[PDB]
Design a protein around this ligand. Structure first.
Ligand code: GLC
Length: 148
């Protein structure tokens, strides 16, 4: 109920039901941007770019991957808090949770590689929307990202 299933070009994810699309492009390869109408710092994007890589693991570790796409994050401090990996349909997924400072922004990145394309999903919220009951709008959103 709190989320709506979004079917995109070769992917799917859960998007907070009250968020609205924004056509303004902020990221290279951006194909999706949804945000809280009342606070644009709460948002999710999906970006698709060409890659010669065959798996997200080709980048190295999750942290090594993030270093190579640091355009995703003026940010003065970026702390990787936790990482994870998963495998679905023979495809590897990387997950990172990040706190950035120029309070801070709470960001979650999901990434995978398929069919000559790099897929990145990033969701974020500021302190005002980082509280018990609202974290799912960042966390479920980003971790729900799947190839389809
Ligand atoms: O508490 C519920 C609210 O939490 C956050 O502010 C979300 O951005 C919003 O979409 C949701 O309705």
């Amino acid at each position: 109920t709190d989320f709506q299933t979004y079917n995109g070009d070769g992917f799917k994810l859960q998007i907070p039901s009250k968020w609205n699309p924004n056509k303004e492009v902020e990221y290279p390869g951006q194909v999706l941007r949804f945000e809280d109408n009342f606070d644009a710092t709460s948002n999710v994007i999906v970006a698709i770019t060409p890659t010669d890589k065959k798996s997200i693991t080709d980048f190295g570790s999750p942290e090594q991957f993030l270093s190579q796409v640091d355009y995703l994050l003026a940010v003065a401090i970026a702390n990787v808090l936790e990482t994870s990996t998963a495998e679905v349909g023979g495809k590897q997924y990387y997950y990172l949770s990040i706190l950035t400072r120029t309070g801070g922004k709470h960001q979650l990145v999901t990434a995978t590689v398929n069919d000559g394309k790099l897929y990145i999903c990033k969701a974020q919220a500021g302190d005002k929307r980082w509280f018990k009951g609202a974290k799912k709008f960042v966390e479920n959103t980003a971790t729900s990202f799947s190839l389809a």
